[PDB]
């Protein structure tokens, strides 16, 4: 019911990250259980949760493509991209810190999906 929103938070939300370098990515990807198999790309959104939720309303969002929403405001983000040939741990990640608007899918006014294509 709210399980998708809570899984969005686990996969894509980190309120106040510690130094957004490769070691941040390798650590947080483990902590969030995204390392079996190694997820190929994943982006974390920083700042407060309320700004992300607001994308689902007209406050901080517009409709986008087929049933996505795109934010009006820009977010501090960090993209972890897997390096090395192997799908399996240890999972080495290159971090790319970014600042831009983001694309989500909303369900019941909650974000339940992050569109990763924009960070590739």
Residue numbers in the entry: 2 to 121
What do the authors of the reporting publication say about this deposited model?
Like RNase A, ANG cleaves preferentially on the 3′ side of pyrimidines and follows a transphosphorylation/hydrolysis mechanism. In addition, the crystal structure of human ANG has revealed that it has an RNase A fold and the catalytic triad (residues H13, K40 and H114) is conserved. The enzymatic activity of ANG is several orders of magnitude lower than that of RNase A towards conventional RNase substrates, but essential for its angiogenic effect.
In the native ANG structure F100 and V103 residues (located on β5 and β6 strands respectively) are in close proximity to the substrate binding site involving residue E108. The results from two variant structures F100I and V103I are analyzed here and both the variant residues are well defined in their respective electron density maps. On the other hand, in the V103I ALS variant structure, the side chain seems to have gained additional interactions with residues I46, I56 and F76 making the hydrophobic core more stable. This provides some structural explanation for the altered catalytic activity for this variant.
